[PDB]
C-alpha cells in the first residue's frame, strides 16, 4: 500500500524537478558560447553549464521534504558534496544512447566525449561517467524514481562535514522507504526486479565519480589562468 504521505512526497518531488528543470534548455543561450575548434576552449561554456546546474540543484534541494528542518550548515555541506553527483544524475535526461552524447536540442548544445575532454577532464573521469549514463539509461526509471533518487542522493548522512548525521539519516530514510514502496506498488516486472538495489548502486558509482572529479578539478584549477575561466559559484562549491 502506497501511503498518503508517500504519494505527497512523490508529488512534491516531481513538481520541484519540473520547476527546476527545463526540457527546452533555453537558458543555455546565456552561457558563453561553446567553442569546439584549441585547449579547454569548451570549458568556458561548460563551466557556465555546471554553474547553472548547481543553482537548479539548490532549488530542487529546498523543495525536498525535511530538508528545511536541517541546519543551514548541514544544508551547505550536503549541497557542496552532492552538487556534482546530482548534476550527473539529472543530466541523464538530456543524455542519449544514439550518439553517446548529452543532447540539448542543438548541435552547439549537444555535448560529446571530445567536448567534455576540451573542458579539461581526463578519460579517467569520462569513461566511467559515460558508462554511468548508459547504466542509468538502461534502468529506464520512472520520473518519480528519477526525482526520488536525486533527493536521496542529496540527503546523505555520510557526506563530509555533516554536523547532524542522525537527523539527516532520518530525512533520507523517509525518501528511501518511499522509493522502495513505489517500485513494489508502482513498478511492473521485469523492470521492477532488483531495481532498488541497482539505484543504490548508482549512488555508489556517483561517489566514485565525484572523487574522480575532485582530482580533475584540482588539476585544472591548479593553474590560476584556468581557475579564471570558472564561475564564482563553481569556485565556491568545488575549490578556491
Amino acid at each position: 500500500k502506497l501511503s498518503e504521505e508517500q504519494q505527497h512526497i512523490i508529488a512534491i518531488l516531481l513538481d520541484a524537478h519540473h520547476k527546476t528543470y527545463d526540457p527546452t534548455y533555453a537558458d543555455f543561450r546565456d552561457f558563453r558560447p561553446p567553442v569546439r575548434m584549441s585547449p579547454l576552449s569548451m570549458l568556458p561554456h561548460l563551466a557556465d553549464l555546471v554553474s547553472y546546474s548547481i543553482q537548479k540543484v539548490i532549488g530542487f534541494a529546498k523543495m525536498i521534504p525535511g530538508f528545511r528542518d536541517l541546519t543551514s550548515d548541514d544544508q551547505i555541506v550536503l549541497l557542496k558534496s552532492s552538487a556534482i553527483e546530482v548534476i550527473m544524475l539529472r543530466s541523464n535526461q538530456s543524455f542519449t544512447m544514439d550518439d553517446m552524447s548529452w543532447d540539448c536540442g542543438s548541435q552547439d548544445y549537444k555535448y560529446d566525449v571530445t567536448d567534455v575532454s576540451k573542458a579539461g577532464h581526463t578519460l579517467e573521469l569520462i569513461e566511467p561517467l559515460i558508462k554511468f549514463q548508459v547504466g542509468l539509461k538502461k534502468l529506464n526509471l520512472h520520473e518519480e524514481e528519477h526525482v526520488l533518487l536525486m533527493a536521496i542522493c542529496i540527503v546523505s548522512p555520510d557526506r563530509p562535514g555533516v554536523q547532524d548525521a542522525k537527523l539527516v539519516e532520518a530525512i533520507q530514510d523517509r525518501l528511501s522507504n518511499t522509493l522502495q514502496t513505489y517500485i513494489r506498488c508502482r513498478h511492473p516486472p521485469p523492470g521492477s526486479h532488483q531495481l532498488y538495489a541497482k539505484m543504490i548502486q548508482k549512488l555508489a558509482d556517483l561517489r566514485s565519480l565525484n572523487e574522480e572529479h575532485s582530482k580533475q578539478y584540482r588539476s585544472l584549477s591548479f593553474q590560476p589562468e584556468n581557475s579564471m575561466k570558472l564561475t564564482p559559484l563553481v569556485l565556491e562549491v568545488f575549490g578556491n
Partner: peptide, 11 residues
C-alpha cells in the same frame, strides 16, 4: 561557513 553564495541561494 566560508560559503556566502551557497548559503544565500539556500535561504
Amino acid at each position: 561557513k566560508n560559503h556566502p553564495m551557497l548559503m544565500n541561494l539556500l535561504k
